[PDB]
Amino acid sequence: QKLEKAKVQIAVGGKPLIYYLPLTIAEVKGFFKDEGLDVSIADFAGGSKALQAVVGGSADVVSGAFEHTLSLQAKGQFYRAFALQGRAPMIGVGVSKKNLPGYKGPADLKGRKIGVTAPGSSTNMVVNFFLAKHGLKASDVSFIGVGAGAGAVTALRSGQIDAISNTDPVVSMLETSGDIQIIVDTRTLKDTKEIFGGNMPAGCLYAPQAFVDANPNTAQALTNAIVRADKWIQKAGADEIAKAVPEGYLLGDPAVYKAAIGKSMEGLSPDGVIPEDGAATALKALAAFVPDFDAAKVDPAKAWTNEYTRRANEKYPN
């Protein structure tokens, strides 16, 4: 089985975040090269921009949040998730202790500036789900795109935003420095289930159904690499992981990055496998807050498949 497309371009909205560690581990360990792939990765400020790179034809596959497949299918666009990086969202929402030191509850977010990676991204979706739960609307706040790294940290620290939704190590950098109060945490499976009522698959590889139709062996090769990266991560110490990523991912604080790997480890997918209740949990989540969203019209089965994750696990048991 030869590769239909050896040269693949991946778009990720936040490559340095622990949310996408499997992607980076697959690249630096040569797991894509082992499958005969020539993978380019283009980074973007958040997942909404990374998705637009694929829609726009600049990239082939998205490394982004699973819930986007369902949101797209609602608009009539068919995309398919086929390898999992994260099995919980691992998204934190923090209020600025500097600007909202009296914070009493969700009321107090009204009229305020809330940092997300990019508008329309999962970071934004989690806050909107929170707001809808507590009887607020999206238009009650203003969302500011601050990206996936240093900008996001300094934007909060400096007072430019009053709250932030992001992942480790950005979230952890701010925790440790005493700068945010956490109001939503989805780093653990338990906290996630408490909020969404089932598994919320997070980071994954997903692509237009057309790409999956034209390039089955390429999709398997990609999936092989993620699955191998997932399994490496689970056996590696924080130290080995910090040794493997580019130095910029540490945000100048190796000790915090290593504690962040510890806090977010439960959320990383151990083997690439998409959980069975995932798409339905995600669809149910989107129907709580997306306006004029009609979940009845989406077929969740057309958003995802373990076809390739089963074979990748067959082929790389260890």
Side-chain angles (χ1 to χ4, degrees), residues 1-74 76-103 105-136 138-159 161-172 174-242 244-318:
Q1 327 211 50
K2 207 140 206 196
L3 297 167
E4 311 82 0
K5 204 177 176 43
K7 268 172 160 192
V8 185
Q9 173 75 70
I10 306 183
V12 56
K15 195 183 185 175
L17 301 166
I18 286 144
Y19 195 95
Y20 297 114
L21 185 63
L23 176 73
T24 287
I25 291 308
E27 172 176 53
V28 307
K29 304 295 176 179
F31 297 165
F32 296 132
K33 286 184 185 132
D34 291 347
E35 310 285 336
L37 294 173
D38 177 14
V39 168
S40 298
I41 295 165
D43 192 29
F44 294 82
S48 56
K49 301 290 280 168
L51 174 56
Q52 186 64 44
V54 175
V55 175
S58 292
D60 302 308
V61 171
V62 187
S63 176
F66 183 97
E67 68 254 23
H68 289 290
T69 54
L70 290 151
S71 150
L72 284 157
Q73 203 200 107
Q77 295 291 320
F78 288 83
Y79 286 54
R80 170 100 47 193
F82 57 90
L84 208 62
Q85 300 182 62
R87 56 175 178 182
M90 293 178 289
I91 286 158
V93 186
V95 315
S96 177
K97 296 186 173 225
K98 196 198 173 166
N99 300 356
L100 290 161
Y103 180 97
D108 306 336
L109 305 178
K110 189 156 155 162
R112 297 281 186 181
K113 291 196 280 272
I114 305 194
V116 303
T117 46
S121 302
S122 191
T123 53
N124 198 159
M125 306 272 210
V126 169
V127 176
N128 275 145
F129 180 94
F130 187 75
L131 289 175
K133 279 303 129 212
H134 288 89
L136 286 177
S139 50
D140 296 335
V141 301
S142 44
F143 295 103
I144 306 284
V146 297
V153 166
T154 54
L156 192 296
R157 257 180 214 158
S158 64
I161 47 168
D162 304 295
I164 183 165
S165 184
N166 215 296
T167 84
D168 271 332
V170 172
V171 168
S172 274
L174 295 169
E175 276 176 305
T176 310
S177 56
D179 291 309
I180 54 182
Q181 168 181 7
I182 299 291
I183 67 173
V184 179
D185 195 353
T186 53
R187 280 179 288 188
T188 66
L189 288 161
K190 186 165 167 285
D191 283 335
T192 300
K193 294 212 170 39
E194 200 171 356
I195 301 167
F196 293 109
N199 295 299
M200 271 294 283
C204 63
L205 299 177
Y206 72 89
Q209 179 63 46
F211 169 89
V212 179
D213 284 359
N215 307 293
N217 294 130
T218 303
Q220 192 62 62
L222 294 167
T223 300
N224 288 350
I226 299 294
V227 164
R228 293 183 69 198
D230 289 343
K231 296 189 179 213
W232 192 85
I233 294 163
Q234 290 294 314
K235 306 178 211 142
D239 288 325
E240 282 178 60
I241 296 165
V245 297
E247 216 180 349
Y249 292 16
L250 305 180
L251 288 180
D253 202 0
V256 156
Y257 187 84
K258 289 170 195 185
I261 285 302
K263 288 186 272 194
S264 288
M265 184 92 78
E266 175 165 81
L268 286 168
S269 176
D271 57 7
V273 169
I274 309 181
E276 69 290 327
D277 73 323
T281 303
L283 186 57
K284 182 187 154 184
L286 291 169
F289 74 93
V290 182
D292 290 61
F293 184 88
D294 185 353
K297 284 168 183 297
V298 178
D299 183 2
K302 307 197 157 300
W304 67 284
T305 187
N306 275 319
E307 177 175 346
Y308 312 103
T309 62
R310 169 171 293 288
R311 273 192 234 108
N313 280 273
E314 279 175 58
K315 179 161 193 185
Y316 298 105
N318 307 310

